[PDB]
Design a protein around this ligand. Sequence first.
Ligand SMILES: Cc1cc2nc3c(=O)[nH]c(=O)nc-3n(C[C@H](O)[C@H](O)[C@H](O)COP(=O)(O)OP(=O)(O)OC[C@H]3O[C@@H](n4cnc5c(N)ncnc54)[C@H](O)[C@@H]3O)c2cc1C
Ligand SMILES: Cc1cc2nc3c(=O)[nH]c(=O)nc-3n(C[C@H](O)[C@H](O)[C@H](O)COP(=O)(O)OP(=O)(O)OC[C@H]3O[C@@H](n4cnc5c(N)ncnc54)[C@H](O)[C@@H]3O)c2cc1C
Lengths: 487, 520
Amino acid sequence: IFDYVIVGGGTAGSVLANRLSARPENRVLLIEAGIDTKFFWPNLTIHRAAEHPGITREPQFYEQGRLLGGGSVVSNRGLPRDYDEWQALGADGWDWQGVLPYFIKTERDADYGDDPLHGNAGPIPIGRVDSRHWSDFTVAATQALEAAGLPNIHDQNARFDDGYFPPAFTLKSAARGYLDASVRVRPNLSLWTESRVLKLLTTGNAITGVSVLRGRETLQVQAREVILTAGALQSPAILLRTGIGPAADLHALGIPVLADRPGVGRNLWEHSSIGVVAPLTEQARADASTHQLGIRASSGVDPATPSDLFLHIGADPVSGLASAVFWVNKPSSTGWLKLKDADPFSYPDVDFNLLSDPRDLGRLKAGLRLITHYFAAPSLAKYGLALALSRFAAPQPGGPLLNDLLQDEAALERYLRTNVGGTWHASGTARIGRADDSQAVVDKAGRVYGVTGLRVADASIMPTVPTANTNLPTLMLAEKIADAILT
Amino acid sequence: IFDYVIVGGGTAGSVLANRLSARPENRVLLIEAGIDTPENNIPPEIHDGLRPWLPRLSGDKFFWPNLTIHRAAEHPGITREPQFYEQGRLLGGGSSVNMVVSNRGLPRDYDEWQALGADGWDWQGVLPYFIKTERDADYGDDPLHGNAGPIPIGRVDSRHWSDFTVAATQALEAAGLPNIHDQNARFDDGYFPPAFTLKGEERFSAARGYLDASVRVRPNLSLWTESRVLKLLTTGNAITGVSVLRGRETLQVQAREVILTAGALQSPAILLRTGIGPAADLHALGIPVLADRPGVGRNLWEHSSIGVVAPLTEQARADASTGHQLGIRASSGVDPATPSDLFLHIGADPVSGLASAVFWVNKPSSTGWLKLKDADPFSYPDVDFNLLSDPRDLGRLKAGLRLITHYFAAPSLAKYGLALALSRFAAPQPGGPLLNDLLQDEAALERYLRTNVGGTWHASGTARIGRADDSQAVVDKAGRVYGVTGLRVADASIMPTVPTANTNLPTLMLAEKIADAILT
Ligand SMILES: Cc1cc2nc3c(=O)[nH]c(=O)nc-3n(C[C@H](O)[C@H](O)[C@H](O)COP(=O)(O)OP(=O)(O)OC[C@H]3O[C@@H](n4cnc5c(N)ncnc54)[C@H](O)[C@@H]3O)c2cc1C
Ligand SMILES: Cc1cc2nc3c(=O)[nH]c(=O)nc-3n(C[C@H](O)[C@H](O)[C@H](O)COP(=O)(O)OP(=O)(O)OC[C@H]3O[C@@H](n4cnc5c(N)ncnc54)[C@H](O)[C@@H]3O)c2cc1C
């Protein structure tokens, strides 16, 4: 009988395996469906933009890590206001002051590790490119940003106003930080790779372990506590197949209901993305030859949500393209997922419902206007780049000219509703909330309401997606939950 | 016949006199009601920059005598009284009598000025004029700063901080606030050594910056001190001169353009008396309406303020010795649309024996108005700042008091054992209720705040820039008054909103920009 069985060995699971097995008396098992460290869940499709008249949506492949260390290189925290809002929404203690010590605990900052908002002893090394190694292309971009009044904020992780910066990244995954060779040798930590949890085992309303598919056979593993860290799409599906979720939906599938929890699979957040590309002219190719540049900006669409855009300006001599890709980093739209059926091998039916709130369409237009503004500044205009729209994930030629789409706002709206993407920042499907909030799924230490023996401790638990790439925040949150468990 | 007559030789007037007279062909007269402050004879209570509070201890001497205002919105169960409102009356105006702090606000303030219909007045647009005004002693080489302008700006070295200040910073670090170092090129929440204008120990007003001996020698520049403009001279809808009281004699001065830079309470009164204002108000006083402009005297902004004080305990007084020290930009959480809506100072004064935490709402929702009492050129306007008319400002003030509580509970500050009590902002003194007791009694706190809420001398917005089709607008993007010709306003009156800032540096900026628009 294990003390803790952790379901899924990705970013959060690795943290928890490490932290919980640090105590010799904790017998811990981490189960991961992928290989030890093609690399994704095969044939996993999702609906992207909200159903809309005139537009025809199809299912799209959505990459989710399927390997030890999972989704884990850009490594950023978000803003104080994100975490203060998590507390306002019922995540007691998850305000900025509450999460900041866990952001510190996770990291070793090469550049700023002695500053009071940083760590210098954590397992995840974080650093930035020296802004002196910047290409002349990047420099020209910074001169255009300067002319609009943007400072170089240097360190996006301890300075929170609008501006530009060298992006912080982890380069030497969460597997090599948290499951290094010292940790894997621990006697009390087991680590099953290529092994897939099928179902949670229950005794009444207690979860008592898991059924696992390992090699060719199905095993039962008994457990005092089960922690789901299967990801924001699969953790809530596991909950739903277990009978934890909206009763009517489960009864429709013949699933016996352990607890009627209407928040399970709701509150699906993402960041809404789009690209702009141009072929590199010769000056631009040459200048680019000498993660460079991130930009935090405000769209002005909603005064309540400053710093709601993230943009990256870059040039790549290899594909022969300049690009400006960006996303809505503080959105208003949310989606949902539900089961297709009770089969443990089925993926859920996922609808991100992107641009369902028209403020997000407003934000993408504003971002596009900002990009035309910057590239009109002399130091970027000199390159004579011809900017065309593209999908965020597949930045390639084929889209219409930026300057011409902005002059046809109905055509602009059609293009964005058709081609809007995600940034793989799926979150919020098993959210933290108060004991008397009927849409909450877990308490402030990840314990699932309505049952015993079960926590959730991955990106599913985020009350909202933060103003950030979701890997560092997930590491933080796993750190915080581990500490609460250890009590 | 002057090309430009500038009414009011204060912060903006000084800038405009200097910039417009830089071209030999421009015949410029600057008219100032108060005394001269020439560099060889600055009054000692003005010249002392380490004690900028001293003009206020000289009484009336350096201010508009007996200028009174209404402060807090009328509210049932609280009577309010007229209160004296300091406004500079001498060359350099407000910058000759101020607390010497020099900050810009935030990009969002000016981006909002553009959204409100002030085209060109966004952050990108005002930034070059902020750079032009300053020579920053600490960061003048950096991208968002200047190193060659006439107003020197600097900060205390953090090394030189008292142990008390240092303890306060530890308390704020525990709250997760960084030292932002430079409040004028970094715009997130946190704490900093405030930026201020001084030349060594001496005050450095806009008069010293812009009206020095080398500029006063200009033969095309005229400067009339102890001379008070009474009326604008009008021929149809064109303004064509001024009448001026000099001693007991009244004179007329002809002008191609008149620029009003008389301050945010007096510039709009001049407009109203000329017949440029809401028509029904003017009819009621029998002033002939030259142009029906309902925004004149509306849109009066301010920063709403309160203090918290405690007797210095032994350790606190000792810690206070060792070395404008510490400012704090913070968010109230009242409205997610207005981050950084609070400003706080924490310090210890061994003279009074008082530690204090004074703060104001730096992005308010409430606005007030002024109107004329009568047509007499010598009367002051009827001014109602209408503070806490919008309940969110009450919430911001309660939120800042809670923030102050939290900070002072930190070990670095708790060790001092300070008994924090409420106070009016302008005159910090005993007599107010204990902070911790009054936060246990919301209705008592309300009544206290509504009774004792103060301003910060950041009056603004009473002749606002706005769009050529906006009934509430008074001036265009270059300060030209809609409905007449020959008249501009170029002072703090024209700000569409008060920024997240003490208003001296933003006024210098706006006068630089307006001068430039004029010269093009
Ligand atoms: C291609 C891509 C690029 C990204 N880039 C970045 C980036 O640059 N910066 C950033 O901050 N974030 C980025 N993200 C997002 C970030 O990686 C995720 O938000 C983060 O990994 C979420 O952590 P998690 O622990 O919730 O889930 P995951 O890290 O996805 O871990 C879930 C794990 O559970 C396993 N699993 C699922 N079901 C079962 C089962 N039944 N039994 C056993 N195991 C199971 C999966 O195989 C997986 O290993 C990226 C994501 C992707 C997909
Ligand atoms: C006591 C005090 C302390 C302050 N502290 C600071 C601070 O530390 N930092 C900061 O940024 N801001 C502070 N301020 C605010 C800042 O000083 C003002 O907002 C700024 O001076 C406004 O400039 P202005 O040109 O609009 O008006 P003013 O500087 O007030 O200039 C108006 C001038 O016109 C003159 N005038 C008026 N009517 C007539 C007339 N009929 N004829 C001739 N002349 C006339 C006046 O005598 C005055 O000189 C302070 C203000 C005061 C009063």
